[PDB]
Design a protein around this ligand. Structure first.
Ligand code: RWZ
Ligand code: MG
Length: 281
C-alpha cells in the first residue's frame, strides 16, 4: 500500500461510514473511478460537517482554492490532509468543477442562519447547493465526454437524492430544529410539523409528503431515461445508486411515514436491486 492508497482508503471509510447505499453502488466502479468518487465524497462530507464555528470550513475552502490555483505544487493543507491530497491527485487527472465545491461551501455557510423556505423554489435551490453541485463535480468521473446534458442529468440526480433524503429524515431534522418543506406548501396542505411530530401522521401530512415524493420519483424517471449520458461502466452503477435511494421512499411508506426513526434499505435488499439491474446489462 503506497501512501496515496491510505489517503484514498481513508476517503473510502468516510463514505461508507456516512452512506451505506452510495458506498454499496459506487464501490462497484473500476478502481480509477471509484477512488475519485471516494475522494470527492469525503471532501463534501467534511464540508457538510465542518461547523458541528466557520474556521474549519474556511480552511477546507482555502485548501480547495490552493489545489485549483496550483494543482501540481506541494501544499501544507490546513484542514484534512489525507482528503485534500486525494482530491489533489484526482484533479491532476480529471477536470474538477471547482465552482461547484464553492457553491456547496456557500450553502453550508448559509445554513448557519437558516430560516425556513418560503416557497418550493427556495427548497429546490437548497437541493441544488447541497447536492446538485455534487452531481456536477462527479460528472467528469462518471462520463466519457461531458456536455451540458451530462451535467444537467447528474445535477438532477443529485437534487432528487437530496429530496429523498429530506423525505426520509423529517423527524430527525425536526429534532435538530430544521424543517425543509416550504412554508407555502405547509400552509397549502394544512400541516404543522411540530404538531405532526407530537400526534402522529394524518392525511394532510401524507398528502404533503406524497406531493414531494412524486416530484422525486418523476425526476428519477427522467434521469433513468437519460442514463446513456454516462460511461457504460457507470450506467448500471448509477442506476443501482438511484434505485437503492429511491426504495427509501417505499420504506418510509411501509413504516407509515413515521417521524420517530430513520428507515433504511437492508443490505440484502440492495443486493436484490443489484441483481435486477446487473441482469438488464
Ligand atoms: C450521488 C449523486 C449524483 C449526488 C450526491 C447525492 C447527495 C449529495 C446527497 C444525497 N444524500 C445526502 C448527501 N447530501 C450531500 C451533502 C451532505 C453529504 C456530503 C456531501 C454534501 C455529499 C452528500 C452527502
Ligand atoms: Mg446541510
Amino acid at each position: 500500500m503506497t501512501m496515496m492508497d491510505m489517503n484514498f482508503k481513508y476517503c473510502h471509510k468516510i463514505m461508507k461510514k456516512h452512506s451505506k447505499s452510495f458506498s454499496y453502488a459506487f464501490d462497484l466502479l473500476p478502481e480509477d473511478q471509484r477512488k475519485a468518487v471516494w475522494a470527492i465524497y469525503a471532501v463534501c462530507r467534511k464540508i457538510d460537517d465542518s461547523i458541528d464555528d466557520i474556521q474549519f470550513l474556511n480552511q477546507i475552502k482555502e485548501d480547495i482554492q490552493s489545489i485549483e490555483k496550483y494543482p501540481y505544487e506541494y501544499h501544507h493543507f490546513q484542514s484534512d490532509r489525507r482528503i485534500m491530497m486525494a482530491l489533489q491527485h484526482v484533479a491532476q487527472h480529471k477536470n474538477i468543477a471547482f465552482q461547484s465545491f464553492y457553491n456547496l461551501i456557500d450553502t453550508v455557510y448559509k445554513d448557519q442562519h437558516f430560516t425556513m423556505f418560503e416557497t418550493d423554489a427556495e427548497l429546490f435551490g437548497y437541493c441544488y447547493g447541497v447536492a446538485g453541485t455534487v452531481g456536477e463535480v462527479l460528472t467528469p468521473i462518471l462520463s466519457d465526454h461531458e456536455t451540458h446534458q451530462t451535467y444537467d442529468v447528474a445535477r438532477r440526480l443529485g437534487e432528487s437524492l437530496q429530496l429523498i433524503n429530506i423525505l426520509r429524515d423529517v423527524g430527525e431534522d425536526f429534532e435538530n430544529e430544521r424543517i425543509y418543506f416550504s412554508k407555502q406548501r405547509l400552509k397549502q396542505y394544512e400541516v404543522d410539523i411540530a404538531e405532526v411530530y407530537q400526534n402522529g401522521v394524518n392525511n394532510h401530512y401524507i398528502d404533503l409528503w406524497e406531493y414531494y415524493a412524486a416530484i422525486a420519483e418523476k425526476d428519477f424517471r427522467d434521469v433513468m431515461d437519460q442514463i446513456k449520458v454516462f460511461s457504460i461502466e457507470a450506467q448500471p452503477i448509477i442506476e443501482l445508486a438511484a434505485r437503492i435511494y429511491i426504495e427509501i421512499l417505499d420504506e418510509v411508506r411501509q413504516a407509515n411515514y413515521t417521524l420517530h426513526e430513520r428507515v433504511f434499505v437492508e443490505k440484502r435488499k440492495k443486493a436484490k436491486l443489484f441483481h435486477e439491474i446487473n441482469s438488464k446489462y
